[PDB]
C-alpha cells in the first residue's frame, strides 16, 4: 500500500492542451540561443542557461519525461529522466522563465499542481503566483517555457500529460516483520546466535528520492533511469556482545563497546543527508537535502525526529559480572541493534549498513535454563560525548530471557 | 505502533533546572498585574494579557500541565490542560514574553525542543531565535516567563520536566481490516446487504489534536482533559443504490445520486477543517487549522492530498437498464463508498459520518447467479461542478460479481 500521487510513481510528458504535438523539453542551451520558429521579441532569444523548449514530442526521449517528487508541504520537485536536473522558476532580464538546475533545494524548485478537471492542470510556482506555459501562446511553435501571472490575455496555462512511462524501476518494498525472541541455548557449548546469524526484523521502510542519494557507483543521470527511488530499511536484531562458560562463583570483567562510530555517521550523512541523533538509536537528524521529505521518511521508516544538536557516538563500559549460581553456566549477553540499510530499486545494497548498538536494552540466554548472572559494577571507560552518562544501578540480576530497558529506577549518573 | 515523541503522548510540567520548586504556570492576568516576590523593574509588572508565572508546582494542578502537539516541520504547539490555550511568543513594551492564546495557528505558537542532554532541553521560538526562561533569572521567585536571545548576561534557559501525567485518555486505535467481497444472493427475495448492514473495512485511522475539533458538546477546556486526541477513520463499504426483480426483457430507468452533498462537506469543514477534493473520494483539502499536520494525517489515514480548487459534489445520472436474460432475475447494484468517521478517546461518535459514493467503482449481485443486466444509456441529469463529466460507454454488460472501474477505454465525455 504505497501512499503516493500517481505523478510520483511514473514519468510523464507536460504539454499545453492547446498544442497539437508539442511538449516541455529539457535544453542545454546558453543565453543568445535563437528559437527559429518564434516571432521576434523576448520569446525568440534565450536569456538563461538551460531554458525549456516547446518541442515536438518523441516517444521515449528522456528530455520530455518528468517525475514529480512529493514534498511534505504538498509541493513537488520536478526531475527529468535525461540528466536528473529539476525545474526552477527564474527571473532573467525581467522575464519569468522555467529552467533546469541541480536539486538544491530552494523555494523556486517547488511547484504546486492545480487540477482544473480530471485531465487538465496548471503548474504553480511557490511564492511568485506564476503559471508555466508557452511564450506568447505559440503552442505549436519552437519557443521557450515561461512562468507568468494570471491576467486577461495572458497565454492559457492549462496543461496535460501527453504520454506516460509506467515501467520506471520502482522498488518492491519488503514486508514488515516483528522482532522474534532469541532461541533458548541447547547445551554448555552453545554460544547463541552471532551477529551475522541473528534474524533481522523489518520495523520500517521508506522510499528515498535518488536526487540526494550520493550512490558511489551511479551518477545522477543513471540513478534517475535505473533507481529513481532508493529504499531505506529500519531493521532490528539481537546483537551478542559476549558469551562464556562460568564456574560456580566465577567473576569476569568485559569491555562493552556500544553506540555507533563517527565514521559510520559521516558515511550515512554523505550518502543520504541523515544522521542518528544522540537522543536515541531511532532518532533522525535531517540536513538541508532530506528535510523537505522528513515527515514521510519518519512515518514510513517508523523512526522519530531527533531534538539533539549532537550525533550518537560510541561508549566503552567496563562491566564486572559474578556467577552467584552454584552451577557451571553458559551465559550469552545481547544488546538490541538498530540496522539502517540502503538498497537500489534492483535490491542491490549501496554500502555497509549503519548499526547502532543500544546499551539501554539488553537480554540474556543461559544453559542450563532460568539461570541468572549478577552485574556487580559498571564504569564508563570512555565516551565520544557527554549527552548520556547514565549507568546501571548495581547490583543488578540479569535473568535468562528477561529483557531489561533503562529507566529512572534502574540507572544513575556515573559519579554517584 | 504509535509514531509520536513521548512529549506528545503525556502531559508534563516545565521548569528551570535552577528552580528548587517552581514551574511554568498558566495565568488569566491583565497588564498592570503585580508579581509580589519579584525585584522592581520589567519583571514585577505584567505587560500582556495571560502572561505565564514561575509558580510553586502543585501535583495535579492543570495550570502547570502541557502537551506537545507534533507538527510536520518538527516544531510543536504547546497546549495547557486547564483551558486548552497554547503558548505564544509576544513582544509587548519591547519585552519578549510567553503568553497563552487560542490556537490560531501562527508562527509565534511554534516551538522547537533543543536537547542539551538526556534530561535537559531549551524551548526555542525559531523565527525570533529566543529561548523561554524566568525573568532576570529569579528561578525561586513568583515572576513572569520571558523569551530572550542568547547573550553573556542572559538568564540560563536550560529546562526540565518536573512531573508527568501519563494517564491522559489516549484513544485505542482500531485494527486495519480489508474490504470483503459482497456475499452471493441466496434467492429472488434476497435484496443483498443494505448500506446500514454492509461491513466496513478500516483502511486507515489517524489521531487528530483536539485543538481544532469543534465537538458540538465538549468545549475546549473539557476536550483537552477527556479527549486530547480524536480519531479520524477512513472506512470503505459496498453501498447498494438499487435492487429489483426483472422479468425477461424488462426495461427500467433509475436516478443514481452519487458523490457527497454540499451540507456534509460544510459539516466536515466546521468539525475538523478538512474537505474532500473533487479529484477523488480519498483526496483531502486542508484549511489553515489542519494544514500543519497534513502529512501525518495523510500517512496514517491512507488518503492523498487533493490538487483541486473545488470540493467533491453530487451528480445525478439517469440510467436505462435492460434484462436481456431469458429469466426472472433479482439484480442488486452497488457503488464503492468512502466513509469518514470521527470518535472521541472513549470511542463515542462525534456526529454523522461523511460519505462519498464513488460512481467510478461498481459491482452487481444476481439471483440466479452469473446473470448479466445491460446498461443501455447514461445521461447526466445535473452536477454541482464540471470537474468530472465522464459517462460509461454503452451498451455495457454488468455481470454478477465483476467489479468495473472507470478507465479511458470504458468511458467518454457526456456530449459524445
Author numbering:
A (entry chain B), B (entry chain A): 49 to 464
Manuscript text:
The Cry48Aa/Tpp49Aa pair is produced by a number of L. sphaericus strains and is composed of Cry48Aa, a 135-kDa protein belonging to the 3-domain family of Crystal (Cry) proteins, and Tpp49Aa, a 53 kDa protein belonging to the family of Toxin_10 pesticidal proteins (Tpp). Mosquito toxicity bioassays have revealed that both components in combination are required for activity against Culex quinquefasciatus larvae. Within each Tpp49Aa1 monomer, two distinct domains exist: an N-terminal lectin-like head domain covering residues 49–214 and a C-terminal putative pore-forming domain (PFD) covering residues 215–464. The final model of Tpp49Aa1 revealed the presence of a homodimer forming an “X” structure with a large intermolecular interface, similar to that described for natural heterodimeric crystals of Tpp1Aa2/Tpp2Aa2.
Diffraction data were also collected following mixing with pH 3 buffer. In total, 466,741 diffraction patterns were collected from which 279,362 could be indexed in space group P212121, (a ~ 79.89; b ~ 82.84; c ~ 157.88 Å; α = β = γ = 90, highlighting an increase in unit-cell dimensions in comparison to the pH 7 dataset). Manual building and refinement from the ensembled diffraction data led to a model with Rwork/Rfree of 0.189/0.213 at 1.78 Å. Similar changes in the structure were seen following a decrease in pH from 7 to 3, although this is not physiologically relevant to pH values found in the target insect guts. Briefly, mixing at pH 3 results in a larger increase in overall binding energy at the eight crystal contacts (5.0 kcal mol−1) in comparison to mixing at pH 11 (1.8 kcal mol−1), suggesting that crystals may dissolve more readily at low pH.
